[PDB]
Structures are given as structure tokens and as C-alpha cells.
Amino acid sequence: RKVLRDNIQGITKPAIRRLARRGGVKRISGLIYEETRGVLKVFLENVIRDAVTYTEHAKRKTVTAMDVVYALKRQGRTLYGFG
Amino acid sequence: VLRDNIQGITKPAIRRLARRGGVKRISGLIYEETRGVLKVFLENVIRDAVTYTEHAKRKTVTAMDVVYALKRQGRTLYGFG
Amino acid sequence: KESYSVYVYKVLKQVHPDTGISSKAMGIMNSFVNDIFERIAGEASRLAHYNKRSTITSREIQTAVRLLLPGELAKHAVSEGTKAVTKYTSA
Amino acid sequence: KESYSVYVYKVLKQVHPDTGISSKAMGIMNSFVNDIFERIAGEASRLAHYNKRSTITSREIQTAVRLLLPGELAKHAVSEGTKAVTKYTSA
Amino acid sequence: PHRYRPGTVALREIRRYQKSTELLIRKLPFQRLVREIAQDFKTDLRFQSSAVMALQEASEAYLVGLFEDTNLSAIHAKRVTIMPKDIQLARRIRGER
Amino acid sequence: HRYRPGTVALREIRRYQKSTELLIRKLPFQRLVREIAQDFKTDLRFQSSAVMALQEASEAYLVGLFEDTNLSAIHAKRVTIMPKDIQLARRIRGE
Amino acid sequence: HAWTHRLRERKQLV
Amino acid sequence: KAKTRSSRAGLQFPVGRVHRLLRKGNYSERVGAGAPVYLAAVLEYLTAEILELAGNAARDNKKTRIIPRHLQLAIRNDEELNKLLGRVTIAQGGVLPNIQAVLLPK
Amino acid sequence: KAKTRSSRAGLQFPVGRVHRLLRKGNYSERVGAGAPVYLAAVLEYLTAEILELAGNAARDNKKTRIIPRHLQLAIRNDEELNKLLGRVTIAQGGVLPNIQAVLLPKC
DNA sequence: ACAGGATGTATATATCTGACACGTGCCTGGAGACTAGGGAGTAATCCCCTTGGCGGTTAAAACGCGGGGGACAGCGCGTACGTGCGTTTAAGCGGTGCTAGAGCTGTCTACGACCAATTGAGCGGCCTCGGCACCGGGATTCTCCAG
DNA sequence: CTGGAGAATCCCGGTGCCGAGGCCGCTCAATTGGTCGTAGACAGCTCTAGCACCGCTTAAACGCACGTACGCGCTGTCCCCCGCGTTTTAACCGCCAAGGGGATTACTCCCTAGTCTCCAGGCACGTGTCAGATATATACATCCTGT
């Protein structure tokens, strides 16, 4: 509720398998799943620590979608479709 | 005026770069294949660096025109600015 | 400035006079035009400082187009823009 | 503006009071300082447009430092710069 | 009874998920992940609903970008499965480690 | 006597990773650059430092492939790098 | 010492 | 007689809105007169060829509204737009249908 | 009577030079007073770590004069400066002496 | 392989529905007209430095040869992963409700641009000299096969 | 595998010299000192929309079992690449000369900011309605285990 512990296991095994099959992956070993949790963990930390600092600079308690776009335009991963 | 000139990048010269890269053993088909890489890589830098000189209405490619072309392609080079 | 969606829709009716566009697809085209805008103008600004000038002209943009657009997109858009300037000055 | 080589050499004598620096190594440090300058100022300029302001303050640079410098370089340089501002206003 | 060979259902799904464009992670566990990470930077943050949807659709586009490259690094060295060597290799070539 | 094959190649890696000098002969490099630029605009001129900038950038680019080509060949349980590996490593790189 | 508290080096001695 | 500059130049993108965004963008001290005319042709040209190709893709799926799947298929099946938009992801875009030939039977 | 504003901040980088580069650099319409003071301290801090590390590099190679191999060795032997300068080519830089573990003579 | 059983997959028709396209009012931002001034065009210098050539030294490239180490194909084991079924857990609607805070408006004032007068910090130039480099000379240090 | 073995990297001292490094003038840029005026801080208020909770579906995750196809280790072959030697090519250096073109300076004009008036294009906000989604039955193109 407050501390919000361990939701990285919320990304399940068949959720990862769907993402792999967009890439055209036919066979998946059992050790990908713990690695893939570890990968986007450090991916989201690099995006959120940018997008929060836009909001703290604008003195807001919320985080807008435009702040996320500015964090991703920063890292060479520009989004289209949010402004 | 100038003939086939990519052959000036000699076989031991390509070997020296791979030794600095840390390659212990090199197959034979690479020597006619890295020459196809510089031919791509220089045509993407000299194409940009000429367009700085044509914009500034010069005839000599300066050192900064190379650095501005390299900084644009994400290869920032120090030691010439 | 809020959008380009009027102007995008005029081009779409000009090219494909029957097809339509969803709102989500319009918002991508709206974000698309804004992206290339500060790609070109943000880079043509750097050409002014590299030549110690203070005006951005059509010449400053024409070389900025040749840096950004690869291949035949350069050879068409440069030919496209010079048609617009010569029509603009003659009228 | 032509160089920073006087100011680089003052820092070098302050840190290592015996070592020296070649001219080619000075030209890299000269190009180094110019690179981070428009990394910070070129990005802190974008914070002014994102908040529709027109002044660049120390607050505009402090958040621009926290975006650019990773890890403990952020935690030191922010603490470094606020020492300089408070000394500047008090004197 | 009827039973497909081990690999025909796999190729069936690759044609399925490359055809459609929906978001593949369930929303409420992802929308709970972002508040796990945001607590370590500033307590008591609030999120626009479109801000979280931007975080799926970039991160899902990021992970599919990996599995296109880890697949190539597994076809290279003549395999079909993907070991976690492949993920570790096709991030160190990209320059992420 | 004669060394076993490989031990000389290791000693070069000990040496060329220690030096910083340019590994391509400079005069055939200038002749290469002036004929590539021959195609774009005829009758161009070059500053001498402008070519040396193209020297050091392109050498650092090719070295940049060969530590990533080398990781491709180790990944294939091999030692010899091959043109399969270069075509891989620049394709993951995004070229 | 010029600036030790200002600079960062904790681990390790290399 | 209004006679807007886009109509005066024969374009359809707003020359005035480009000219204001150049001046209110801290790009330079001055902006030339022919400069926003030249941008408005280029931006109108690039949006013409995407809607050319995306209109072809919507016809191939027997639809009339262009959906952002069609923008994804229009860009990724053109090699010059791929070099322009390599670092760009598209929301609700998806991936090209592409299966590696090694994985196919048998 | 001079009392240069960099000396008021207790720095060595020229605050007045930085303030001039911000104004004619076309970054905004206005530049605050505390802005070039805060920026010059940051630029001083970054040079103060490279020259401290490259100074240790030349001392380890028994030389009293930093040449740009020492800048290459000082940057690439971190993880923060390496991350900051990950796409930077240094003139006359060379490579770290790295050899893969598989490419070694067995026994 | 053939075949047919079986399973998906495509196809056609029908029927909702809600988002798209269109219309309207309005308003504020673009156009017109004009003035002022300075940025930039242009001509004319200078003179740096780039191109071209030459001759000699010699390091490096090229070539050939022999051999062995590595690539690669083949084979076999066996286990880890797909397929599928049954069970179970939450995601997902959708509906309600609360209030935090985002957004906006209106003052107002401190802060930065601008200016003019005024130095001195920093550039250029010019010196010297010593750090580093090259040379030579052993001095350890791996590498190597014949035992 | 040990052992001299030859080869090689290291440490050593010695010339020695060119490039750091510290002088010198000196001038152009930073500083001081005021002075507008407006950007921005701040208070106040509106109300959106985000958080929280509810239940109730049911799709999707989970767990389990099974067989099998792939990973992986092993072996053997051979050939392709390394190492070494000899020979040849041309990079490199130093020197020289010529002039193109970069760089700078005056000069002047034409272009653009700026102001004000003016007004119509393009916003917000509406509203019908058809493209599309969903469903259902049909026809079809699959995989595949048998024979």
C-alpha cells in the first residue's frame, strides 16, 4: 500500500514471451526471464530519474506525459503520439 | 584523375588496427571487407564536411569542418577545436 | 500555435482524395512535423554561429536540409524549396 | 574568447603543483570545456522553453547539471556550485 | 488426440503478434511498477494516466528492440534458443554496459 | 628457432595497445581522401590538420569495430574473426 | 592537498 | 486583400506560423524573409510522401482511415525514411512482419 | 577596486567570460546573475577531477608532463567519466590495454 | 508421399456505434504599410600555406613457403523447453466519491538589460632551459623444444 | 617437463634539444554605477482529474506432465592462416618554388526589426453518420500422423 514491495514479478513469464515473439524468437531458454526483469528495471530507472527532475524543476507534484517525452527525446528514443 | 586508391589501405595496415582492437587471428576475407567500411565511413563524413565548405563559400576543407561533421554524427573528436 | 492538423488534412485530401485519418494518427503527424522543425531550425542555427552571422536565410536552411535528409529526399526537397522561393519573390 | 589554457593551468598547479601539460593535451582540455559548455547551456536553454520562461537562472542550470552528470558527479558539482553562489551573494 | 509439433505453435504466435499492435504487458502490474521506482526519487508523486501509457509503449518498444538483436546473436553461433549470453552481448555492443 | 603461431600475435596486441601512433601510412590516406572528395566537388583543397582529423577519427572508428567484431567471434566459440562478424556487429550497432 | 572533500575518490586505490 | 504568404508562395503550410516559431525560438537574432518560405515547402514535402505511402498501405488493408499501423508500415518499408527516423518509435505502430529464414521448417 | 566577480565566488574560471558567452550564445532572452557563477564552478569541478586523475597517470608512468595518453587512461579508468565521455574520440589517445581472457595461452 | 482428419484461418453478411468530418461563431494572430539602421554584400588588398616537384634513404610492403592449429562437419547423449490441460488468481470494467493540485488571473517589485566611463587582466610576443627522447649497454624475463 | 636456449622486454646512464614556461607590453573586454520596466514571484481561486474503493466477471496466469528436439560435448579432418625469410616498392624526409585563396578592411545599401492598424483565418464547439468492430456461418488451407 505504502512501501509497495516487489512488483517486478508482476511482469510474468507469458508477458515476456509475447514481447519475444514480436522480435521473431522461436525458442526461449528459462534464464531469460530473470534477466529481462533486470534489464527494464535499469531502463525505467534511467527514464524516471530524468522525468522526475523535470517535474521537480517545474515545482509540480504530478508527472505529465510531456515530461516522459522529454526524458525519451533526451536519450535518443523520441516518441510520437503524445505531444 | 585518381585511380583505384582504396588499395593503399594495405593488408598489414588493417592487421595493425585489429591488433590494437585485440584480435588474435584474422581470416582472409576481411581485408577486402574493411575497405568497404572506410568507403562507407568516409563518404558519410566527407559528404557532410564539403557541405560546410560550400556553405561558407570556401575551397579548402578546414579542420573545423571535419569536426563539425563528426560532431553531427555522434563522433565527437577532441584535439582540433 | 496548437496544431498542424488543418494543414495535414489539406495535404491528405490533395494526395489521396478519398482516404481519411484517425485522431491518433493525426497526433503522430502533428508530433512528426514538430520534430523535424527543431531538427532543421535547431541545426541551421548552428550554421549561423559557425560563420559568425546573425540572420537565418534560405541558404542557411538549404545546407541544413542537405545535412539532415538522406539520399533522394535531399535532392527533391532542395528542388522543392527553391521552387517555392522563386514563386514567392516573383509574386 | 580564444582559450581556457590560462585557467586550466591555474587549476593544474593548484591540484598537482609539480606536473605539467603538453600543448596537445591542453588543446584537448580546451575542447573539453567547450563541449560541456553547450551541453549544459544548450540543454538549460530547453528548460526555459519547457516552462515558457525567458531567463536562465542558477536553478535552470542546477537541474541541467542533474540531467547531464551521472552518479556522484551530480552530487558533488551541485554541492560545488551552491557554495559558489552563496559566496558570491554574501560578498 | 491431435498435437502440434514443438515449434509450429511458436511460429503461429510470431505471425500473430507481429501482425497486431496492442500493448502486451498487463497494465495494472506495470502501472504499479512505476510507483515502485518513483518512490526512490521523490515520495508522494502523482501520475497522469497518459504518462504511464507513454512508459509502456516506449519500454515495450525497447524490449522488442532487444529481442530482434538477441535473436540475431543466437542465430549467430548457430542456435535457435536464446541464452542470456545473447542479451549480455547485444547490449554491450550497443554500449549500455 | 621459431615461435608457435599466436604468441607473436599476442605480443603485437601487447604493443599496439600501448602505443598511440597512427597505424595507417599517411600519404596513401591523403590520396584516398582526395579521390572520395573528387566525387562530391571537383578541385578541392585541404588543410593538413583537416586530413589528420580524418585520420584519427577513422582509425578510432575501425578499432571500435574490432573490439566488437572480436566479441562476436568469441560468442561463436571461435578465435578467427570473419566477415560474418563485422556484418553482425555493425548491424546491431545500427548501420 | 587542494580539494579532497570536494573531489570524489573513495574506492579504490588503483 | 489578405493574400497570405502561403497562398503567395503556392504552398499549404502556414508561412506566418513558421516565421513566428523561428523568431520565438531563440534560433538567431534575425530571420530572413525567404527562410520560413523555404521551411514550409520542405515540411509540406516530407508530409506529402508519408501520406503518399501510408495512403497506399491503408488501401492494401481495405481501409480508409489511416491508422498508425499504416504510418509504421509506410516508414519502415522505405529505406530513406528509415535513415531519417531510425531513432524514432511510434505509438501503436508495431513491428514489420519479419521472420528469420533459419527458423522456418525444415 | 577591480574585484573580479570570479574572485568574489572564490573560483578560477572567468565568470565574466562565461556570462558573455551565455548572452551572445542565443540560449535565452535573459541570463540571470547567479547563472554564470553557478556554471563556472561546475566547469572548474570537472577539470579538477580529470587533471587530478591524469596527474596520477603521469606520475605512474614516471613523467612530469601530462600528454594526451594520460587523458585517455584517466577517463576510461572510471565509470562516471567514461559514461560522460562515452562517444568522445581523443586525439592521440590510444586504447586501454585490454586482452580477452579466451585469447590466452593455456597451461 | 498420400490423405483425410483436424485445426486454424480467411470470407461474406449483418448489425451497431461512436469517432470522424463538417459547420459555425468568434477572435487574435497574420498581413499591410511605413520608418530606421545596421548587417551583410562587395571590392580590394595582403600573404599565408597549400600544391607541386625532386632526390635520397630505408623502412615497410609484398611474396613465397611450410606447418599446425583451428574451423567445421558429423555424431550422440539427455535434458531442458514446448504443448496442452486443468486450476486459480487478479486484471479489467464501471461506477462512485473525494480533494489535491494544476491551471489561471491579478498585483507588484526586484532583477536584468542598457548605458557610459574606466582600467588591468589576458593575449601576443620573446626568451630560456630542462624534460623527455634517442642511443647504447647490459639485465632480467618469458618462450621454447629437446630432453 | 626442465632446461639452456635465443630472443626479448626492462633498467640503466648519457647526450641534447626543442618545447614548456615564464617574462614583457598593452589593449580590448570586464567592472562600476546608475536606471528603467518587465519578467516573474505570489496570492487567490476554480475545478479538473487523479487517487481510492467497490464488486463481478473471466481472461489470463499458474502449475503440471510429457516427449522431443535442440544444445553440447566429442572426434576427426584439412586447410587456411601464421611465422619467417627475401626482395621490392614507395613512404618519408628535406628542400624548393609558386600562387591560389583565406583573411582582413572599407563602404554602402538593401533588408529586417519595429510599430500600428486591421481583419479573416483557424480555433472551440458543436452535430449527424458512416467506417469500422463484432458476430456468425462458410469455405478454405493449412499441419500431420499415419499408411
> C79-82 long-range CB contacts below 8 Å, 24 or more apart?
C80/H41, C80/H42, C80/H45, C81/H37, C81/H38, C81/H39, C81/H41, C81/H42, C81/H45, C82/H38
- With a 7 Å cutoff on the CB, does I5 touch strand K? yes
Query: Is A33 inside a domain boundary?
Result: yes
Give the total residue count for chain G.
14
Chain B window 27-56, residues with Cβ within 7 A of nucleic strand K = 27-29
CA-CA-CA-CA dihedral for I17, I23, I24, I29, to nearest 10: 180
Q: Where are the beta strands (DSSP E) in H1-106?
A: 30-31, 65-66, 88-90
Q: What is the C-alpha to C-alpha distance for residues E89 and F75, in angstroms, rounded to an integer?
A: 8
Third-level CATH fold of E8-93? Histone, subunit A (1.10.20)
Q: What is the C-alpha to C-alpha distance for residues E35 and E4, in angstroms, rounded to an integer?
A: 42
Domain ranges of chain I: 5-84
- Going by C-alpha positions, the residue among D61, E60, D67, H18 that lies closest to residue A70 is D67
CB–CB contact H52 C81 (8 Å): no
Contacts of G12 (CB under 8 A, 6+ apart): none
Domain ranges of chain E: 8-93
- With a 7 Å cutoff on the CB, does H3 touch strand K? no
Count of structural domains within chain A: 1
Q: What is the C-alpha to C-alpha distance for residues E59 and A44, in angstroms, rounded to an integer?
A: 8
User: Any idea what the CATH number is for the domain that residue A71 is in?
Assistant: 1.10.20.10
Residue with the three cell numbers 484517425? C22
CB–CB contact A53 D47 (8 Å): no
For H28, the grid coordinates are: 538567431
- With a 7 Å cutoff on the CB, does I16 touch strand K? yes
Query: How many CA atoms are closer than 13 Å to the CA of I104, on its beta-carbon side?
Result: 7
> Burial of E23 by CB count in 10 Å (0-12 exposed, 13-18 middle, 19+ buried)?
middle
Rounded to whole angstroms, the distance from the CA of residue H51 to the C1' of nucleotide K73 is 56
Query: Is A83 inside a domain boundary?
Result: no
Q: Is F75:B23 a contact under the CB 8 Å cutoff? A: no
Phi-psi region of F41 (alpha: psi -120 to 50; beta: other; left: phi over 0): beta
Residue with the three cell numbers 516508414? H75
Alpha-helical (H) ranges within E3-94 are 8-17, 27-38, 49-75, 84-92
Query: Is B80 inside a domain boundary?
Result: no
Rounded to whole angstroms, the distance from the CA of residue H9 to the C1' of nucleotide K57 is 61
For H70, the grid coordinates are: 499504416
For D37, the grid coordinates are: 559548455
Which residues are paired to H90 by β-bridges?
A: A80
Which superfamily does F7-93 belong to?
Answer: Histone, subunit A (1.10.20.10)
Q: What is the C-alpha to C-alpha distance for residues H73 and H53, in angstroms, rounded to an integer?
A: 9
> Which element (helix H / strand E) includes I30?
strand I30-31
Q: Is A52:A63 a contact under the CB 8 Å cutoff? A: yes
Q: What is the C-alpha to C-alpha distance for residues E31 and F42, in angstroms, rounded to an integer?
A: 59
Q: Domain range holding A31?
A: 8-75
Q: What is the C-alpha to C-alpha distance for residues C23 and F67, in angstroms, rounded to an integer?
A: 47
Q: Is F67:B17 a contact under the CB 8 Å cutoff? A: no
Query: Alpha carbon of H66 to those of E39, E57, H70: distances in Å?
Result: 40, 20, 6
Q: What is the C-alpha to C-alpha distance for residues D25 and D48, in angstroms, rounded to an integer?
A: 35
- Going by C-alpha positions, the residue among E36, F18, C76 that lies closest to residue B19 is F18
Domain ranges of chain D: 4-90
Q: What is the C-alpha to C-alpha distance for residues B38 and F28, in angstroms, rounded to an integer?
A: 13
Residue with the three cell numbers 554500449? E95
Looking at domain D4-90, which CATH architecture does it have? Orthogonal Bundle (1.10)
Q: What is the C-alpha to C-alpha distance for residues H17 and H27, in angstroms, rounded to an integer?
A: 15
Query: Is A80 inside a domain boundary?
Result: no
CB–CB contact B52 C50 (8 Å): yes
Is the Cβ of A33 closer than 8 Å to some Cβ of chain E? no
> H80-87 long-range CB contacts below 8 Å, 24 or more apart?
H80/C69, H80/C70, H80/C71, H80/C72, H80/C73, H81/C73, H81/H49, H81/H50, H83/C70, H83/C71, H84/C68, H84/C69, H84/C70, H84/C73, H86/F94, H87/A76, H87/A77, H87/A78
Q: What is the C-alpha to C-alpha distance for residues A21 and E64, in angstroms, rounded to an integer?
A: 8
Contacts of A62 (CB under 8 A, 6+ apart): A55, E45, E46, E47, E48
Q: What is the C-alpha to C-alpha distance for residues F72 and E90, in angstroms, rounded to an integer?
A: 10
Query: Alpha carbon of C5 to those of C24, C29, D12, D77: distances in Å?
Result: 11, 8, 57, 44
Instruction: Please report residues of G whose CB lies closer than 8 A to that of I74.
Output: none
Third-level CATH fold of H5-84? Histone, subunit A (1.10.20)
E60 φ/ψ angles, rounded to the nearest 5 degrees: -70, -35
Technique of determination:
cryo-EM
Name which of I44, I52, I84 to mutate to probe chain G: the one with the most chain G Cβ atoms within 10 A of its Cβ: I52
Residue with the three cell numbers 538522406? C70
